[PDB]
Amino acid sequence: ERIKLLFKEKALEILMTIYYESLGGNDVYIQYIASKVNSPHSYVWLIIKKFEEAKMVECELEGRTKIIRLTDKGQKIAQQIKSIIDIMEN
Amino acid sequence: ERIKLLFKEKALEILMTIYYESLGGNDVYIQYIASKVNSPHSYVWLIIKKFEEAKMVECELEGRTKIIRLTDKGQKIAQQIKSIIDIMEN
């Protein structure tokens, strides 16, 4: 609620989901993402495409499953948003 | 445009306006803000009230002019959003 003041909650949910998921060791599949956020498959996809065009993520198809990886740029942004969320919820 | 993906452009415009204005030496008057952003006086006011309730800004009336000052919390957030904008537009 306090984060929605400055951020687009849904696009943020996606980014941070990708971020925490990747630093966990997992390959980030788009299906897992949609299952973690409050957005339908179509929306997560639209946002993911937007991230990729902004060079924050890079995508790849492995068989029929779409894998999403953060570029260094996407990584730096997620890390700084994390400290802002910390500062926010505190 | 690339910033609107993750951020609420209008609330962001206000915060960064306050931030740059204050580090410039100026007292931040709400009138100057509305004159720098693409938001009507009513909106800048609504957003300012929201910042204050979130303890990012503190307000004060000097005569009939409203002065806005960033709390340490508001300051840290603005500084980190700045590096994200740098990273973004680059």
Tab-separated table of C-alpha atoms in Angstrom:
chain	number	residue	atom	x	y	z
A	1	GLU	CA	0.000	0.000	0.000
A	2	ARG	CA	2.830	2.361	0.902
A	3	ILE	CA	4.782	0.962	-2.038
A	4	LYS	CA	1.902	1.572	-4.461
A	5	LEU	CA	2.396	5.308	-3.877
A	6	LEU	CA	5.591	5.367	-5.984
A	7	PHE	CA	5.529	2.005	-7.792
A	8	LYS	CA	3.391	0.032	-10.205
A	9	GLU	CA	2.666	-2.863	-7.863
A	10	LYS	CA	2.037	-5.493	-10.545
A	11	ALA	CA	5.127	-4.790	-12.672
A	12	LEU	CA	7.124	-4.618	-9.444
A	13	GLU	CA	5.718	-7.974	-8.216
A	14	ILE	CA	7.007	-9.594	-11.394
A	15	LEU	CA	10.520	-8.105	-11.249
A	16	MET	CA	11.141	-8.923	-7.592
A	17	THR	CA	9.682	-12.429	-8.099
A	18	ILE	CA	12.168	-13.001	-10.899
A	19	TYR	CA	14.943	-11.505	-8.708
A	20	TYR	CA	14.398	-13.586	-5.588
A	21	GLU	CA	13.708	-16.714	-7.653
A	22	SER	CA	16.943	-16.416	-9.569
A	23	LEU	CA	19.156	-15.716	-6.539
A	24	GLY	CA	17.611	-18.862	-5.061
A	25	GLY	CA	19.251	-20.992	-7.716
A	26	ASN	CA	16.192	-21.735	-9.807
A	27	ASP	CA	15.799	-21.191	-13.512
A	28	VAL	CA	12.971	-18.677	-13.711
A	29	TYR	CA	10.095	-20.125	-15.697
A	30	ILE	CA	7.274	-17.727	-16.647
A	31	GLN	CA	4.735	-20.226	-15.288
A	32	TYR	CA	6.206	-20.070	-11.812
A	33	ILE	CA	6.012	-16.276	-11.961
A	34	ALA	CA	2.289	-16.135	-12.835
A	35	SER	CA	1.764	-18.573	-9.996
A	36	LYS	CA	3.456	-16.226	-7.509
A	37	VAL	CA	1.844	-12.897	-8.518
A	38	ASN	CA	-1.740	-11.596	-8.693
A	39	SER	CA	-1.709	-11.284	-12.446
A	40	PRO	CA	-3.097	-13.578	-15.143
A	41	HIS	CA	-0.722	-15.333	-17.584
A	42	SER	CA	-1.467	-12.720	-20.270
A	43	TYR	CA	-0.420	-9.837	-18.052
A	44	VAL	CA	2.778	-11.424	-16.753
A	45	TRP	CA	3.654	-12.051	-20.398
A	46	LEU	CA	2.975	-8.462	-21.483
A	47	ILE	CA	5.109	-7.160	-18.614
A	48	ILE	CA	7.914	-9.677	-19.340
A	49	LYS	CA	7.998	-8.587	-22.966
A	50	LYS	CA	8.248	-4.993	-21.764
A	51	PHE	CA	11.180	-5.834	-19.500
A	52	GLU	CA	13.009	-7.587	-22.323
A	53	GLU	CA	12.550	-4.622	-24.699
A	54	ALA	CA	13.968	-2.465	-21.902
A	55	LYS	CA	16.920	-4.867	-21.715
A	56	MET	CA	16.283	-5.810	-18.072
A	57	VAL	CA	15.496	-9.418	-18.938
A	58	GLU	CA	16.490	-11.841	-21.613
A	59	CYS	CA	14.215	-14.724	-22.593
A	60	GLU	CA	14.708	-18.165	-24.022
A	61	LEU	CA	12.553	-21.130	-24.979
A	62	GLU	CA	13.585	-24.542	-23.724
A	63	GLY	CA	11.210	-26.944	-25.429
A	64	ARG	CA	7.826	-25.378	-24.653
A	65	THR	CA	8.768	-23.625	-21.391
A	66	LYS	CA	9.870	-19.969	-21.392
A	67	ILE	CA	12.876	-19.192	-19.182
A	68	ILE	CA	13.523	-15.635	-18.009
A	69	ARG	CA	16.920	-14.300	-16.920
A	70	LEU	CA	17.781	-10.797	-15.606
A	71	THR	CA	20.484	-8.916	-17.549
A	72	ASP	CA	23.040	-7.074	-15.384
A	73	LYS	CA	20.898	-3.989	-15.883
A	74	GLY	CA	17.762	-5.796	-14.660
A	75	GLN	CA	19.764	-7.092	-11.717
A	76	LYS	CA	20.998	-3.678	-10.513
A	77	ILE	CA	17.504	-2.211	-10.677
A	78	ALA	CA	15.984	-5.048	-8.615
A	79	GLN	CA	18.696	-4.736	-5.963
A	80	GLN	CA	18.073	-0.996	-5.499
A	81	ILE	CA	14.284	-1.393	-5.412
A	82	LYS	CA	14.810	-3.948	-2.649
A	83	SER	CA	16.596	-1.416	-0.404
A	84	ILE	CA	13.815	1.088	-1.110
A	85	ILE	CA	11.192	-1.459	-0.052
A	86	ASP	CA	13.207	-2.104	3.099
A	87	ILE	CA	13.347	1.618	3.806
A	88	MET	CA	9.643	1.837	3.016
A	89	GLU	CA	8.380	-0.984	5.232
A	90	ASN	CA	10.345	0.401	8.173
B	1	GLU	CA	8.396	6.162	-20.762
B	2	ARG	CA	10.846	3.500	-19.617
B	3	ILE	CA	10.442	4.812	-16.078
B	4	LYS	CA	6.640	4.582	-16.244
B	5	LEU	CA	7.026	0.796	-16.487
B	6	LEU	CA	7.949	0.502	-12.784
B	7	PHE	CA	7.021	3.921	-11.361
B	8	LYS	CA	4.024	6.186	-10.937
B	9	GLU	CA	5.352	9.046	-13.046
B	10	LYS	CA	3.348	11.826	-11.383
B	11	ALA	CA	4.117	10.904	-7.761
B	12	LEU	CA	7.735	10.412	-8.814
B	13	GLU	CA	7.859	13.841	-10.538
B	14	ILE	CA	6.829	15.446	-7.260
B	15	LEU	CA	9.359	13.613	-5.062
B	16	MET	CA	12.352	14.226	-7.319
B	17	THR	CA	11.287	17.875	-7.790
B	18	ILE	CA	11.286	18.306	-4.027
B	19	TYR	CA	14.648	16.461	-3.840
B	20	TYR	CA	16.550	18.465	-6.434
B	21	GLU	CA	14.965	21.722	-5.251
B	22	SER	CA	16.022	21.180	-1.672
B	23	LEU	CA	19.613	20.149	-2.452
B	24	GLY	CA	19.783	23.373	-4.464
B	25	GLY	CA	19.413	25.431	-1.316
B	26	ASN	CA	15.836	26.552	-1.797
B	27	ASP	CA	13.004	26.192	0.658
B	28	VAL	CA	10.546	23.978	-1.190
B	29	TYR	CA	7.244	25.778	-1.599
B	30	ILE	CA	4.298	23.708	-2.884
B	31	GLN	CA	3.595	26.392	-5.500
B	32	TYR	CA	6.995	25.959	-7.088
B	33	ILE	CA	6.378	22.211	-7.254
B	34	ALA	CA	3.044	22.472	-9.114
B	35	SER	CA	4.807	24.839	-11.473
B	36	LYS	CA	7.488	22.243	-12.265
B	37	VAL	CA	5.299	19.130	-12.729
B	38	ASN	CA	2.423	18.197	-15.058
B	39	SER	CA	-0.107	18.027	-12.274
B	40	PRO	CA	-2.712	20.549	-11.124
B	41	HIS	CA	-2.436	22.153	-7.656
B	42	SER	CA	-5.046	19.730	-6.269
B	43	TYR	CA	-3.072	16.675	-7.317
B	44	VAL	CA	0.305	17.888	-6.067
B	45	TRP	CA	-1.439	18.565	-2.759
B	46	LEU	CA	-3.022	15.105	-2.550
B	47	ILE	CA	0.345	13.489	-3.288
B	48	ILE	CA	2.164	15.743	-0.770
B	49	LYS	CA	-0.319	14.790	1.927
B	50	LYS	CA	0.318	11.145	1.068
B	51	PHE	CA	4.075	11.605	1.396
B	52	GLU	CA	3.693	13.276	4.780
B	53	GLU	CA	1.467	10.464	6.116
B	54	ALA	CA	4.174	8.072	4.917
B	55	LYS	CA	6.704	10.162	6.855
B	56	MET	CA	8.777	11.023	3.768
B	57	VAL	CA	7.974	14.723	4.017
B	58	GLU	CA	7.145	17.136	6.757
B	59	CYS	CA	5.101	20.264	6.063
B	60	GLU	CA	4.843	23.693	7.583
B	61	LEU	CA	2.910	26.890	6.956
B	62	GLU	CA	4.847	30.133	6.852
B	63	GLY	CA	2.196	32.821	6.608
B	64	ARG	CA	0.079	31.568	3.701
B	65	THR	CA	2.789	29.607	1.854
B	66	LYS	CA	3.236	25.863	2.455
B	67	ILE	CA	6.851	24.709	2.811
B	68	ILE	CA	7.764	21.063	2.242
B	69	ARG	CA	10.857	19.359	3.669
B	70	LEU	CA	12.026	15.741	3.141
B	71	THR	CA	12.519	13.678	6.323
B	72	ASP	CA	15.668	11.511	6.369
B	73	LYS	CA	13.456	8.674	5.181
B	74	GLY	CA	12.154	10.733	2.238
B	75	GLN	CA	15.730	11.712	1.456
B	76	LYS	CA	17.107	8.150	1.264
B	77	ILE	CA	14.288	7.042	-1.018
B	78	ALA	CA	14.838	9.934	-3.457
B	79	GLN	CA	18.580	9.254	-3.607
B	80	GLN	CA	18.065	5.579	-4.512
B	81	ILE	CA	15.381	6.344	-7.107
B	82	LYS	CA	17.876	8.728	-8.700
B	83	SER	CA	20.446	5.948	-9.257
B	84	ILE	CA	17.683	3.760	-10.699
B	85	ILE	CA	16.720	6.511	-13.146
B	86	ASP	CA	20.380	6.833	-14.099
B	87	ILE	CA	20.590	3.091	-14.670
B	88	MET	CA	17.320	3.268	-16.583
B	89	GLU	CA	18.160	6.113	-18.963
B	90	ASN	CA	21.441	4.430	-19.870
